[PDB]
Design a protein around this nucleic acid. Sequence first.
DNA 1: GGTTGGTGTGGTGG
DNA 2: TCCGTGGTAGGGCAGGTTGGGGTGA
Lengths: 28, 251
Amino acid sequence: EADCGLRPLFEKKSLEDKTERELLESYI
Amino acid sequence: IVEGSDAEIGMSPWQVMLFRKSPQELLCGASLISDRWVLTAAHCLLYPPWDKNFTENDLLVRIGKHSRTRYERNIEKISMLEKIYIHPRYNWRENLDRDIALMKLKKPVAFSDYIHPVCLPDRETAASLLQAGYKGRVTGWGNLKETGQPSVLQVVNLPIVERPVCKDSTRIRITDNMFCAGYKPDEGKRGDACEGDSGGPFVMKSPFNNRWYQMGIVSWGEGCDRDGKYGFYTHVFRLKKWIQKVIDQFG
DNA sequence: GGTTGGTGTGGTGG
DNA sequence: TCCGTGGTAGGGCAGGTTGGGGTGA
Ligand SMILES: *C[C@@](*)(O)[C@H](CCCNC(N)=[NH2+])NC(=O)[C@@H]1CCCN1C(=O)[C@H](N)Cc1ccccc1
Ligand code: NA
Ligand code: NA
Ligand code: NA
């Protein structure tokens, strides 16, 4: 549970995948 | 996955492939939740209407993969299963209620760029994210149309759907242990899971802490990506206590 | 090479 | 207020790895 949810190749580099924003913009 | 796209490398590092030792065939998806535990759909293992009943020695799991078929040397990890736990209330006849299983690996797996566990939702996460309109993300190597398969892992992002819509969409009895997700006919955009994507994770990214949480397991559907039809997923937060107990009891 | 090596076209594609 | 007594299914009326609580219908 400690390290969970944090992708080495995305969150741990501060890089977004092309379409995660699509999800985040969907929240309302 | 129908009308999805190829996944970026490391994009879904918790994706797991449920495989059958002999004949060597890919059965389902699954997901990495700890270094020793994988969560899949029960019907991947047990489905009596087709006399499916897989033992621990029938199966393997492949973690960190991207190619469906090709051995990803120094990238993927193949593990043997210690024990399978199916939900005691799993209903294989009526509606795949509580379509969930946990599989203990014989030995713990090393995380990496391509292998990394997803978080399970707390109450707050779940309250916050399980709302109609919010999009999550489904991944798998299942079929691209409904009657071929993908070269590499597929991803699609799809919105959670209001319960009355899900209820009206199918003849099948729906439990509060399941949700549905997919675009409506008037939303323009398309997409769905299909056969072979079962046990794969429906996931959502928390705006509160940037972590990805597994809100669903690919359970079932009627066709694949048909207008008026939606993919049905096991409501994971509702069964989280069982998940906890089993882990804590048999880790 | 790649998401990863090299008596390098298979062991797993090209 | 209902959401166990068989059901997916044993033995038993409580709880287990399971009858909790949730956009709950
Ligand atoms: C086992 C999984 O690969 C698979 C997921 C299918 C998802 N389809 C879409 N469009 N998202 N599940 C199934 O194939 C399940 C298991 C057995 C039958 N089944 C179905 O989806 C039926 N078409 C519907 C169904 C039949 C019986 C009970 C519940 C649902
Ligand atoms: Na659809
Ligand atoms: Na090679
Ligand atoms: Na019981």
